[PDB]
């Protein structure tokens, strides 16, 4: 219908999901490696070091939450694994920047920034690879 | 009891709150109004003429107003937000008397010598034309085809909305041109230019399909009978309980019907117009297939528009069962005429058949009904703005404008009248210069510059002018092609008058159960 | 809608629903200001319950935008006017607009006649479009000093493929002139995707 | 003076800009016109004092939405 | 059917008909084509996906080119026109008077928010972008012209003016005129009402 929504609240829902997201999988990616339980509203227990199980099995929360298993599919199709990996770099990648540089106030520096650290990732990776 | 107290008001207060709001009107004034009902259910308003015909109010003086919104259609076709507005202005005096303490039947005898002063001032300064005078029939028509639907249409309307009355009006003065003295009837198909004027009674029906007559020298039917055959008027001696007994029952129908429908035809029909109702299907659709085959036209289940027009205007009556023949009470017919135009619509022209002097057809055509009612709208109001001249002739100014020269010069009338009814009928004498101001309303902000401005400089127009409030500005407003037949408003005060009056003779407690 | 209410269908009755209507009407267009240009911002927009839509294209949005106001519903209808129009606008339209519904129409009753005031915007929306069509100053593919190839460059220029304005400077200047194809009722301009356009890696 | 201002304003605009010498409003005569044609006549500099004062009186306080308040 | 008849009208008259692989991609090169000009570039990037970046850089100019084909008067892209507009006629506001003046300038003021938006959907804002802007146009600098003391014109991706007069980033008149016409419809379309009223 008739509608408007702003920046940094939808910004920081993104990161409200995005950091969830990312959080018991760090533990629970590498050798270190933690189970991310869920309560079913059936009372069962659910204990993955995956996220996008315990994600597609709840409630999803629109913005950032249904952007990942999506990636994560994507990934999970790419090289069959990282889905892990995926979408804990991106709400990494979105929280401590963004609100700095969002009280900054701008979205593209931000943007070219992804892909510089992106490129550092690729040359000194084909380097130390 | 308080009631009669508390309801008069209610009564002028719904009656008057309603028409408060309802004044937007003359001009691209306020935002488009959407309305989605009590119900909740959608419409998109604007325009207030069809608003006030849309409108739909509790409470009975709120009802009242919607009957004064059509009473002035019929009247004038102008002004109908006019006697609307205005509705209010009577309303108004009423409860500031009222307050005064002023009997409301003194209030009531004081619209009639107002409506006696008023509608007489207006007459005062009303502007001559003639009725049967293309060019006066044409200049109110056409401001009264500027601001309507179409105009590059007009062009062809305006003469129309003249032709058909030259017709239609009986010699120089005489009261004349109703709406059924002009027969507008829309066509299926076509453009507005394919909308032409008709003349005579042409009657507009669904004839079944085509292999019709467009041939001339047409009878033109009323026909109350059944074609008196198996399964249509007469007895079918086989009864079906079998395919081979129920396949004849229809062969013994459609072979037995083919002789009438030329025997139909052998009266020289181009045209029967079926009975509207059924005598049991009536006429049978088998049948009034080879009715049309030997070029006869049937609308079966007739509309009403025809029947009465053919018994009027052609002047038809029906006709025995043609197994009895007719009464050669076929109306006066040398044609029937179904045109296609677009290739569409089904059409009987009947020209060379008995007319008053009067029914001039006008036969609307468009591509759709948007486009017919484009012409359509327009040429009526031309044609009753014509009609307007026809039964009150000369001039006002449109949209209340005149109202404002009557506003000053009344009230000195109100004044010098001196009576008890003077106060009312100078307090509403006062309450008219308010139209044109009162319509520039909804619009916006940083807002009353103009208010009384759209008052005093009329005012000061001295009694002869004011502002012109369909084109603008300050001339002497009653011709500026800001106009409307005199007819018109003089109605609007008359309509609201005893309306309004109506209301001051609402007393004790009324609701039949 | 607003205040205590007795009336339904949008009736804030004046001022109230034309406020409302700026306030819905705008509220609609805000999100073209931040959705204007490709650098405008995407808005990834639900079109039922989890079907979303990503775009800053404004008509297109104002399609998936529904109409529940008078002025929701023309400025959707309006935009998408010019969205089918053109589709350059599709933003553009819906912007000033907002402000422009929250201008004259208080005018509109300051008026002496109603009709003086949105002329002012008229005689202006020509005033303009004289001076518009008076523009060749930017925007010159008509001519360069090269002619198109700088133009055609000018525009790789004003673009990044990474390295351009070079074979594709000159790429434009073919692919029209590669177009036989004769627009009808004498137009000298070619199908630009009626060019065969292939791609090596 | 019992006026619409704004199209008084707008036309004295004007009638500054395709005018400009005095054209303005004139209570006195309720009407508008060169002013110091209509002799609405104050010196200069009460204005510049006026300008001066107004000028000043806001700056600072848009320069502050800091303001301290102590009972001590 | 394999037996159906078959004549030489089918035959398809090019100098020579060739086929060239280059890149690891092969086509059927038709060479010089007898019966209309005929041409084809072929892309060249580094990735499949350098070339839908040439493609559409290209299709910027491609489609204006056309499109200045289709309007000989093309008129800077961006905000940068209507930040003229925006002051010329708000000085056209003035001068006309009462309530146009009102008007005129309540058009030209409202003409400066596209430019601002813009860029700061850019990030490149508004001061700067609108200063920019009406810094070129001058009383000085009144007129279109086509030379710039006053640039006009104004990049949409880069959101801040710049040096492009000749790029097919920036749309003809044909797209511009219009939706003038179009917004203030808008503001005149919302008005139309007569006779405020409820139906229940």
Known sequence: NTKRESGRKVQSGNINAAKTIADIIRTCLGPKSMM?????????????????????????????????????????????????????????????????????????????????????????????? | RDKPAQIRFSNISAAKAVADAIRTSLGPK??????????????????????????????????????????????????????????????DSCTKLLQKGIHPTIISESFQKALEKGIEIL???????????????????????????????????????????????????????????????????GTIDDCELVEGLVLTQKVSNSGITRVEKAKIGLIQFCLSAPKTDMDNQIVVSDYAQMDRVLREERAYILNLVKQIKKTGC????????????????????????????????????????????????????????????????????????????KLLKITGCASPGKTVTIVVRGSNKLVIEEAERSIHDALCVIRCLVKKRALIAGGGAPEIELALRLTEYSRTLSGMESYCVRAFADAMEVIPSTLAENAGLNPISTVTELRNRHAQGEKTAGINVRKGGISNILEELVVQPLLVSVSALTLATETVRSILKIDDVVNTR | MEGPLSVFGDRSTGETIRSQNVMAAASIANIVKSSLGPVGLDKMLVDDIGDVTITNDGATILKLLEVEHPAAKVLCELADLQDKEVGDGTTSVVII????????????????????????????????????????????????????????KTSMSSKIIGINGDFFANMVVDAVLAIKYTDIRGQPRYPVNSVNILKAH | AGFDATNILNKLRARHAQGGTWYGVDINNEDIADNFEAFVWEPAMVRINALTAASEAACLIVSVDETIKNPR | EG??????????????????????DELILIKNTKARTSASIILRGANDFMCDEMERSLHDALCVVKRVLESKS???????????????????????????????????????????????????????????????????????ERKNLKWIGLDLSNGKPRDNKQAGVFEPTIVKVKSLKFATEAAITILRIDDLIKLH
């Open chain 1, 36 to 129: 991310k339980m869920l309560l079913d509203p059936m009372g069962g227990i659910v204990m993955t070091n995956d996220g996008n199980a315990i994600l597609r099995e709840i409630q999803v929360q629109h913005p950032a939450a249904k952007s990942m298993i999506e990636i994560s599919r994507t990934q999970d199709e790419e090289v069959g694994d990282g889905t892990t990996s995926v979408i804990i770099l991106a709400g990494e990648m979105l929280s401590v920047a963004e609100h700095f540089l969002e009280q900054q106030m701008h979205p593209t520096v931000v943007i070219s920034a992804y892909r510089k650290a992106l490129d550092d990732m690729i040359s000194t990776l084909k380097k130390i690879s």
């Open chain 2, 30 to 91: 306020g935002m488009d109004k959407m309305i989605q009902d009590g119900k909740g259910d959608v419409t998109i308003t604007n325009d207030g003429a069809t608003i006030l015909k849309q409108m739909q109010v509790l409470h009975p003086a709120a009802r009242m107003l919607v009957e004064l919104s059509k009473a002035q259609d019929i009247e004038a076709g102008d002004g109908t937000t006019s006697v609307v507005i205005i509705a209010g202005s009577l309303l």
């Open chain 2, 123 to 189: 007459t005062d300064m009303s502007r001559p034309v003639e009725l049967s005078d293309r060019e006066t029939l044409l200049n109110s028509a056409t401001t009264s085809l500027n601001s309507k639907v179409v105009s590059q249409y007009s062009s062809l309307l305006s003469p129309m909305s003249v032709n058909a009355v030259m017709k239609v009006i009986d010699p120089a003065t005489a009261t004349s041109v109703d709406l059924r003295d002009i027969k507008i009837v829309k066509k299926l198909g």
């Open chain 2, 270 to 345: 181009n045209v029967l117009l079926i009975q509207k109702s059924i005598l049991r299907d009536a006429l049978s659709d088998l049948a009034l297939h080879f009715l049309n085959k030997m070029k006869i036209m049937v609308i079966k289940d007739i509309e009403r528009e025809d029947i009465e027009f053919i018994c009027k205007t052609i002047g038809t009556k029906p006709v025995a069962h043609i197994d009895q023949f007719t009464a050669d009470m076929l109306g006066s017919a040398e044609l029937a005429e179904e045109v296609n135009l677009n290739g569409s619509g």
């Open chain 3, 97 to 152: 607009a907002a402000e422009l519904l929250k201008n004259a129409d208080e005018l509109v009753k300051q008026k002496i006649h109603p009709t003086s005031v949105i002329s002012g915007y008229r005689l202006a929306c020509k005033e303009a479009v004289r001076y518009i069509n008076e523009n060749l100053i930017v925007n010159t593919d008509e001519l360069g000093r090269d002619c198109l190839i700088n133009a055609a």
């Open chain 5, 3 to 24: 037996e159906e008849t078959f004549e030489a009208a089918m035959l398809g008259q090019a100098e020579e008909v060739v086929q060239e692989r280059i890149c690891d």
């Open chain 5, 74 to 144: 093309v008129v800077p892209g961006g905000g940068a026109v209507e930040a003229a507009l925006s002051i010329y006629l708000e000085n056209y506001a003035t001068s006309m008077g009462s309530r146009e003046q009102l008007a005129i300038a309540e058009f030209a003021r409202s003409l400066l928010v596209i430019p601002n938006t813009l860029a700061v959907n850019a990030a490149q804002d508004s001061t700067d972008l609108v200063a920019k802007l009406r810094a070129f146009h001058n009383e000085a600098q009144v007129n279109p």
